[PDB]
Symmetry: C3
Subunit: 266 residues, 3 copies
């Protein structure tokens, strides 16, 4: 049953690949670079020209990688939770993958448009850390939405170590999303970020806690609108609202609401 | 002789484990994730439920991991120093491990209490980067206190790369210590930090040096009291004193003494 | 032909090693730590006492490592480009290696002189992240100067992940260069940095881009003179000029020209 369901989702993803515009295609066999399991597998599956020898890109081989990835995530969700919760979480992931593939194309488009230094999508797809982070994040988020609270944090801790970008999986982020450079980025469990958000190194959208067992959870991180740019070093803290079309300056400390259509600096 | 001494310290650590409260225990077999030697081994030994299959947790297996760890550290201290200094340094480490185990329990307690996002200790213990850093730091510090100056910096450079947290091993840090997120954290060779210190990403407690061969060593980094919180981005520099119950704001630049019982921001 | 050329460059590098002053020499066999290919190989070749067992340091073994390194880089430049461009790029690299070796000695000298915490050069050479970054950067830069635009960014993305330091390979940096700690450092494609530059963690010399497909390339990052110090957290942005003998404070936001012989802070 889960195997037949995997076959169908691999088939959908194999066809989407086929019909992806030529910017998402390439005939080159690229250098093989082994990375942590969830990333390695999500990469191959979503953007096969860039990570698989041309000769091996086959609907069947894509199913095989999707199965390896499923087993691994199911194995890990089970360890921290139980077999039935795991089964249900992975079904959720499977259901959402076509959708996440679409969103990730849009994040690639935002990355190219936002980065005067990018030569083409092949480079972003292959090596841009912002993009590796978001790939894994969009998967870890489905797991958070299932109610899972352990393995999904451990996934993002793989991101955290590989890229120095720290996105809590409960964060809610829409498409055309781009983190440039990314080191020192931290995004909180209850962060909400809208469309076309561009974020630099050393930005925090989260919270701090001065001393005096702090209450667990609750909405406590910013909500950011659409078309927002947050400059290198800015710390945006608390349950505050940043409107749409806001550009925040470098090293800004934001602790109160920010109205739409502004530029903040000092 | 060192083998009999290792047996006794493993025995002490095997018993402490036994009597650890149930928050530090679990019956789950967790996913295996291989990490740099000193971390991999300190983890297993100190918090065996989280890193070892239940079936293999045996006083004997804990001695075996302690021996592997000893040999490795002794091998590495010898390379940079000499066999007798190495012998003495490792004896020091062995002597201090029960004590460091106690302190690390307290750091776990501070991490849970300080982090609205933490679900339980199993998660901190397994994957929280602040905590992996402190584990290795508390060991590297004993080596610094022995007078060693090479291998102990190289240990923390393993931390530095894995977690992007940069703690010089000569730093003196008490318990109930918590670094949240941690990327960009830098703590200097002569830093002194008291109890219940909570530190965010992008905090420096160290020093800078404007140009015009700078003098080696000497007390030159802050001394921080008890119950201090240092917000995301704060740079606290020079041989200055921060008193107890100080909360420092995000992006603050601290270069002069800070009296106890204050909040600093702008 | 490329093999005979490799023999000659290995021979030059084997002799330079021989005549390096004794600070760049050691009889100790140091602990083996495996790192990403380009770093692993550039290390061995340039500073053989620190990375090779004494018994194996032989003109011949240095040629063998230079050949492995050449093949790997040629293999990777070919993948993204074509065989003739690759051939020409690697010839360029080979031609520049003696020169880069000299510059890297000077960067070691700047690191020791700039860091009260450094015990000797063996430590910098072995484990200092600033230094691993610069090693790979000086090689990736030759590739950028050849016109290559893919593999050279992917090299520095290996740096980015290992060290959390992010230097675009088109950046132009002179000698006696030192990045201390380094996490969060970002240096832009058109950055120009003069001699004796000392840079701390969380410094950016690059650019940001507020929203509303941004133009590609063009001179857009700072140009920094000689003897400049840029303090922890400073963000220096845009096509601006920082003169010589400037010291910039912690967390400073620099967006306009800075005249020579100043100290900037607030």
């Amino acid at each position: 049953a889960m195997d037949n369901y995997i076959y169908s989702i691999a088939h959908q993803l194999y066809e989407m690949y086929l019909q992806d515009e030529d910017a998402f295609h390439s005939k080159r066999d690229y250098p093989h670079k082994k990375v942590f399991t969830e990333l390695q597998k999500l990469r191959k599956i979503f953007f096969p020209d860039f990570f698989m020898k041309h000769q091996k890109i086959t609907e069947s081989h894509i199913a095989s990688e999707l199965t390896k990835l499923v087993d691994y995530i199911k194995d890990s969700v089970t360890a921290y939770n139980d077999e039935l919760f795991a089964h249900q979480c992975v079904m959720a992931i499977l259901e959402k993958l076509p959708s996440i593939k679409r969103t990730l194309k849009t994040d690639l488009i935002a990355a190219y448009a936002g980065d005067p230094a990018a030569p083409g999508l092949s480079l972003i797809i292959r090596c841009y850390p912002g993009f590796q982070a978001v790939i894994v994040y969009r998967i870890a988020h489905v797991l958070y939405e299932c109610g899972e609270r352990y393995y999904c944090r451990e996934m993002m801790e793989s991101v955290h170590s590989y890229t120095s970008i720290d996105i809590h999986p409960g964060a809610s982020i829409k498409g055309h999303f781009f983190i440039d450079h990314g080191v020192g980025v931290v995004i909180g469990e209850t962060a909400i970020i809208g469309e076309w958000c561009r974020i630099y190194q050393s930005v925090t959208l989260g919270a701090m806690h001065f001393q005096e067992v702090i209450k667990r959870g609750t909405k406590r991180h910013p909500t950011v609108g659409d078309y927002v740019t947050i400059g290198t070093g800015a710390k945006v803290l608390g349950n505050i609202i940043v409107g749409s079309h806001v550009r925040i300056g470098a090293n800004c400390w934001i602790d109160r609401d920010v109205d739409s259509n502004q530029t903040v600096y000092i």
